[PDB]
Amino acid sequence: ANIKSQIKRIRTNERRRLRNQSVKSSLRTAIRGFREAVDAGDKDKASELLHATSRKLDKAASKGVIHPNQAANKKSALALALNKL
Amino acid sequence: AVKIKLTRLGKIRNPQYRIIVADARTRRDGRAIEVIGRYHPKEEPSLIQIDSERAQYWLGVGAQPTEPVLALLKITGDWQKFKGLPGAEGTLKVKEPKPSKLDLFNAALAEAE
Amino acid sequence: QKGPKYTPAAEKPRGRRKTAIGYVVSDKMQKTIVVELEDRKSHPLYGKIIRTTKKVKAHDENGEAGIGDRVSLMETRPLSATKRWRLVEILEKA
Amino acid sequence: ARYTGPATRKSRRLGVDLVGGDQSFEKRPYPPGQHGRARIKESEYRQQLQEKQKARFSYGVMEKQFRRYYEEANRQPGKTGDNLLRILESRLDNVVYRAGLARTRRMARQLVSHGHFLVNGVKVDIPSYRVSQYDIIDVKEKSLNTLPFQIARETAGERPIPSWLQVVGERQRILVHQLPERAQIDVPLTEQLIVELYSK
RNA sequence: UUUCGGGGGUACUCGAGUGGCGAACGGGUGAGUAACACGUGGGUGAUCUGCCCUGCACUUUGGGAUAAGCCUGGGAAACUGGGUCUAAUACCGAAUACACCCUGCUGGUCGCAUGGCCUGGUAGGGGAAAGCUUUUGCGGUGUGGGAUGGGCCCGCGGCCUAUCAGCUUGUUGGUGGGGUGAUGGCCUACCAAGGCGACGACGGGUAGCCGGCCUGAGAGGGUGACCGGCCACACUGGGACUGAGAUACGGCCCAGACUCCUACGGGAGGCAGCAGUGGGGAAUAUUGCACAAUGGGCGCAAGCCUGAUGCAGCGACGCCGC
């Protein structure tokens, strides 16, 4: 509020927040769809939904939106959930 | 980045430094990982001692000397040894020792007789 | 001339986790037993040797340890709140 | 600071002569003032205090400096009494006085404080300067012709130079072989009384 | 180039702007906190680490915008809307990576049980990058290993009070999920009924902790000024965001108290940074000088910034000396 760098950082932090929010919302939607598909009980749609969701997860990990460990945990959980079914 | 800095000691008029290895984020007089020499600029030849092997180790792991420490490392030849450009030549101008008090005592006694 | 594409890490010796020997005083929990550990220090001022007792909660999978058995424990990462010990074996039943 | 008042007062009060050759003390060897003749009550504290006053008014050392000296002497691994005596004797002004270059300790202190001397090639004007082994005390060339040093250099028949000191040059150089021991000190009073007083 | 009103180019240079890095350090204070906060010693087969050093592999390909600029609107102001237009190391799609991540099967080996290691083998899926500069040239991405800085758990240790004897219901344990860098009732559903306490739980009071300091023959007692380390906080109380890293002092959002501006519609602020002011008090200082030295940030560099720091001023406030 008092220092030029702070005002510039206000704007830039806002734009970064918008981007991160979009990425996280997309990831959450993909996970939700996959979970619903597994709940339905069909394997093939769950199969390539898992593939697409894993790709989205580690691609978001590359962007820095989520930590690579978080992507690994989510991928492992989804794969184990599919394997159990 | 771990750096090889100079911390300040001594009293107000006479700064005497220690060549310390410390993180760049710590304060000047903060905790030090290691002490690898000392540097007293107040003397006429400005005594410099650097423990060569520890300096070599810390340069090997990637510590970054500050400008005064870089100048000192060049003077003692440690920097050149680490790089290897002209060789490892000691340019250190050691302080010239002062004759013993006993020498002067006997000299005065003989001068009397 | 080329350096190796893989650099094996410098091996690090494993640490020594704390061990203890005690008596079971409670086994009303699933996979959990409560052990009584005794320590004998000296009084910091009066010098006498003082015997103090302490309760720790260990984890045994199959629950082979009853009440009153001299069991052996080894420290571990937090398995739950308050649970930091793993049952090694029963030295002598009672 | 310094003590500048009459010197004979302290000698009369302490019952001994501290200057060394003063006639007034011999004329009246009793304490000053109106009641210098009254009999005194005897007390160990009084004797110890008077011994300390003798020591610190012979050498012209104030109480705080004397206490520092006593602490230093006690800390040393010898014995306290002679350690204190040797520390007192190692002062530059005392060295100048015992070297026969000053009639009295006061004038030795005045000469030192005025920077008329020079120790180890560097000018020193500090009466409390302590002198170590193989120390060469010299008079600077400018003041060699002054009347004080003149009459000091032509009356070298007074009090003998102690063993630990030795004047070697016709210009009255001083050499210090080692710090004096209790045998060669040759001082009045009793060190044990001072040690007792400072342990109270 | 000129009518002296100025006009064009340049890119030496540079206001404003996009972008990067920094701003989480450094500096202050001791309110809270009787607590894994601190001291000391361990554990992490339960973990993160920007910049720095050092191996290996790369640095392919395409696209859509927008700040600035110009035109225009609203408002008292703070500030803000619309149209048009433009660049990138800004943003986005794909290829490659098989060193990495996930899953299935499978071998050997070490254990301290979950497990760890052999970059084990094998089948399937998948994960990036950025250019600039002619000069000592600087950079980008993945991955192996160092170095540094952390996080979490534990033993032991340091106050007063039963004229405070019961306390606890995510509370104690399990299972499946979720969550996290990481283990864990950290969260959640179900299940079981546990867990702590006279070796003082639960309450009440007081308190930042330590290296140290003072006293003492010592044991011990008192203390935590300077200097040095750790913690906590930044008007009061909550909250997240960005980021390698956040109690985010000189960031954001909300609520509140207070102070200020208002065209009454609405806005602005936070000295426990350095000086300084008022007040309280027995009582504690200059609205000083400099980046010359040391440390730090950005920059290839020259260089810029630094009330950190180096100095000076004031006070017998202390020690020492004259």
Swiss-Prot record, chain A:
Transmembrane stretches, start-end: none
Region (Disordered) location: 1-21
GO CC annotation terms, alphabetical: cytosol; small ribosomal subunit
One GO biological process term: translation
Keyword hit for Hydrolase: no
Gene Ontology molecular function: small ribosomal subunit rRNA binding; structural constituent of ribosome
Protein keywords: Ribonucleoprotein, Ribosomal protein, RNA-binding, rRNA-binding
UniProt biased composition (Basic residues): 6-19
InterPro entries for this protein: Ribosomal_bS20, Ribosomal_bS20_sf
Keyword Transport in record: no
Similarity-based family: Belongs to the bacterial ribosomal protein bS20 family.
Function: Binds directly to 16S ribosomal RNA.
HAMAP family with a match to the protein in the record: Ribosomal_bS20
The name this protein goes by in its record: Small ribosomal subunit protein bS20
Swiss-Prot record, chain B:
Any single Gene Ontology cellular-component annotation: small ribosomal subunit
GO molecular function terms attached to this record: structural constituent of ribosome
UniProt record, GO biological process: translation
Keywords of this entry: Ribonucleoprotein, Ribosomal protein
Record-stated family: Belongs to the bacterial ribosomal protein bS16 family.
Identification of the protein by name: Small ribosomal subunit protein bS16
Species: Mycolicibacterium smegmatis (strain ATCC 700084 / mc(2)155)
GN (gene name): rpsP
Residues shown, of full length: 2 to 114 of 156
Swiss-Prot record, chain C:
CDD domains noted in UniProt: Ribosomal_uS17
Gene3D superfamilies with a match to the protein in the record: Nucleic acid-binding proteins
Record key words, sorted: Isopeptide bond, Ribonucleoprotein, Ribosomal protein, RNA-binding, rRNA-binding, Ubl conjugation
Lineage: superkingdom: Bacteria
Keyword hit for Aminoacyl-tRNA synthetase: no
Region annotation (Disordered) ranges: 1-18
Pfam family membership, one: Ribosomal_S17
Gene Ontology CC terms, in alphabetical order: cytosolic small ribosomal subunit
Molecular-function GO terms, alphabetical: rRNA binding; structural constituent of ribosome
Positions bearing the Isoglutamyl lysine isopeptide (Lys-Gln) (interchain with Q-Cter in protein Pup) cross-link: 93
GO biological process, one term: translation
Protein family according to the UniProt entry: Belongs to the universal ribosomal protein uS17 family.
Record text on subunit structure and interactions: Part of the 30S ribosomal subunit.
Function according to Swiss-Prot or TrEMBL: One of the primary rRNA binding proteins, it binds specifically to the 5'-end of 16S ribosomal RNA.
Name the record gives this protein: Small ribosomal subunit protein uS17
Taxonomic lineage of the native organism: Bacteria, Bacillati, Actinomycetota, Actinomycetes, Mycobacteriales
UniProtKB/Swiss-Prot annotation, chain D:
One Gene Ontology term of the molecular function aspect: structural constituent of ribosome
Quaternary structure, from the entry: Part of the 30S ribosomal subunit. Contacts protein S5. The interaction surface between S4 and S5 is involved in control of translational fidelity.
Function: One of the primary rRNA binding proteins, it binds directly to 16S rRNA where it nucleates assembly of the body of the 30S subunit. With S5 and S12 plays an important role in translational accuracy.
Species: Mycolicibacterium smegmatis (strain ATCC 700084 / mc(2)155)
Superkingdom of this protein's organism: Bacteria
Record-given protein name: Small ribosomal subunit protein uS4
Domain S4 RNA-binding: 90-156
HAMAP family recorded: Ribosomal_uS4_B
UniProt keyword terms in alphabetical order: Ribonucleoprotein, Ribosomal protein, RNA-binding, rRNA-binding
InterPro entries in the cross-refs: Ribosomal_uS4, Ribosomal_uS4_bac-type, Ribosomal_uS4_CS, Ribosomal_uS4_N, S4_RNA-bd, S4_RNA-bd_sf
Gene Ontology terms: cellular component: small ribosomal subunit
Entry similarity comment: Belongs to the universal ribosomal protein uS4 family.
GO biological process per UniProt: ribosomal small subunit biogenesis; translation
